[PDB]
Design a protein around this nucleic acid. Structure first.
Length: 35
RNA sequence: AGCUUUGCGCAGUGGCAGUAUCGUAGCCAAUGAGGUUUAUCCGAGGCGCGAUUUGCUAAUUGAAAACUUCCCAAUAGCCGUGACGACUAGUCGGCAUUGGCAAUUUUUGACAGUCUCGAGACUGG
């Protein structure tokens, strides 16, 4: 259902933001371009 | 092969964000939520409770705003004077420091403005 699409997308995106900030936390790269 | 539809995912431009976006593990819900319009019609979530990550930078207070200071002593132009020295009371060279260096020949400013085709003129009432 569409609410489950929103929840699955938002939790995949939350772990995606979490693992990008995780790879910033390890210090492999400076953070991406802010705009 | 190209066009294209629908759903989903990714990224990007822009817009919106407390009558917005959600969670709900409590209950109810297409075996029908919720309906004053059109009701022998419409058809999706509803009621409560509960929310509103991360990095960077600025500014303020504060003694201190969190990534491995202050203080004393000494060293880093010339005219005179004192010695030392040199050359004939005088002259010269270097050194030293116990006064001075804005009144025509110099270092405390006759300068400033104006106009004309490298060169001159005007004014400072």
């Amino acid at each position: 259902t569409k609410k489950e699409q929103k929840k699955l997308r938002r939790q995949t995106r939350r772990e995606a933001q979490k693992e990008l900030q995780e790879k910033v936390r390890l210090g492999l790269m400076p953070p991406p371009e802010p705009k």
